[PDB]
Amino acid sequence: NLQTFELPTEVTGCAADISLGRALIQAWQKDGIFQIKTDSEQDRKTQEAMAASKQFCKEPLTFKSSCVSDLTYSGYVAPEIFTVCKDLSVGDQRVKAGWPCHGPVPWPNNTYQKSMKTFMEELGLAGERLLKLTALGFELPINTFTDLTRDGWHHMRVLRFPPQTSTLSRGIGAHTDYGLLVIAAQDDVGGLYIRPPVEGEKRNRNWLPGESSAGMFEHDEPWTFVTPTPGVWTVFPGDILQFMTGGQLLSTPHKVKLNTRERFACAYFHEPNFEASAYPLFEPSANERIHYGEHFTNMF
Numbered sequence: 001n002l003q004t005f006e007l008p009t010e011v012t013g014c015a016a017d018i019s020l021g022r023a024l025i026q027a028w029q030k031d032g033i034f035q036i037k038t039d040s041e042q043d044r045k046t047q048e049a050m051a052a053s054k055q056f057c058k059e060p061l062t063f064k065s066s067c068v069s070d071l072t073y074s075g076y077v078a079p080e081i082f083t084v085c086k087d088l089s090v091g092d093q094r095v096k097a098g099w100p101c102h103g104p105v106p107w108p109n110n111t112y113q114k115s116m117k118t119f120m121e122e123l124g125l126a127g128e129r130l131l132k133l134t135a136l137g138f139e140l141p142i143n144t145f146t147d148l149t150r151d152g153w154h155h156m157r158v159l160r161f162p163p164q165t166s167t168l169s170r171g172i173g174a175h176t177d178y179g180l181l182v183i184a185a186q187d188d189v190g191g192l193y194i195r196p197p198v199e200g201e202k203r204n205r206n207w208l209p210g211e212s213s214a215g216m217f218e219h220d221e222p223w224t225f226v227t228p229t230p231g232v233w234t235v236f237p238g239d240i241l242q243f244m245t246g247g248q249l250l251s252t253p254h255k256v257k258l259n260t261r262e263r264f265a266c267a268y269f270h271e272p273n274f275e276a277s278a279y280p281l282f283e284p285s286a287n288e289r290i291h292y293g294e295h296f297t298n299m300f
């Protein structure tokens with residue numbers, strides 16, 4: 001199986017947290033992913049969001065397509081995805097000033113708004129502790145990553161996957177997410193596969209042109225099946241972790257396969273500020289940076 005840890009309530013940076021930080025990096029560098037055990041109030045929010053996600057998907061398509069905005073990438077698309085970005089009314093200057101991807105979220109209904117908003121503030125805390133723990137394992141100052149994520153561009157991909165309807169069973173091709181770290185959630189259906197770090201396997205750097213990671217290693221072994229187990233969130237690093245860590249963490253490649261049954265899932269992104277420039281940690285004299293504002297607009 002894959003390891004299962006329980007984060008503290010607050011990461012103060014003590015001997016126990018730093019040990020957990022080492023336990024995290026190790027699990028990432030061996031298995032490419034691990035699980036964090038949710039409590040009762042974390043599993044309640046996770047299921048209530050999946051609940052609001054399940055009712056929305058069975059609504060008529062003619063309604064779902066209305067949940068779109070020409071100001072944000074938020075809203076519905078046809079798997080059928082509902083992305084939730086930072087919710088900024090047209091009263092917010094960033095939306096007025098015409099900042100790209102800034103604007104309100106076309107929620108289907110307010111009970112979908114509340115259930116998804118409360119889920120996503122909890123994932124933001126688990127991500128902040130994970131970002132504090134990662135720095136402690138690399139012997140970095142505990143606030144190294146969390147300094148970038150103040151009012152960070154956290155967003156989500158509320159996912160539903162159809163059952164296998166043709167003789168093709170592809171739901172999503174091999175890819176690596178483009179953020180700092182991803183926090184996935186999932187029901188009992190199952191269908192998520194990830195690729196661990198393979199020794200000596202060249203990994204393209206997806207934040208650079210001409211070095212895309214998409215579709216790569218898709219048909220080549222191995223691909224760890226991420227089992228549906230009760231009350232856990234799986235955590236794996238994104239492209240911006242790999243860039244900052246200088247490859248000492250690999251952006252976990254993942255792909256989805258369609259099951260016999262309907263599959264609902266989640267995909268939270270704990271990201272830097274939209275005005276934040278990620279930097280390589282172990283090469284200070286290197287002038288390469290990723291500005292998440294243009295990065296997010298580009299990958300979408």
Ligand code: NI
Pocket residue numbers: 175176177254267
């Ligand atoms: Ni992904």
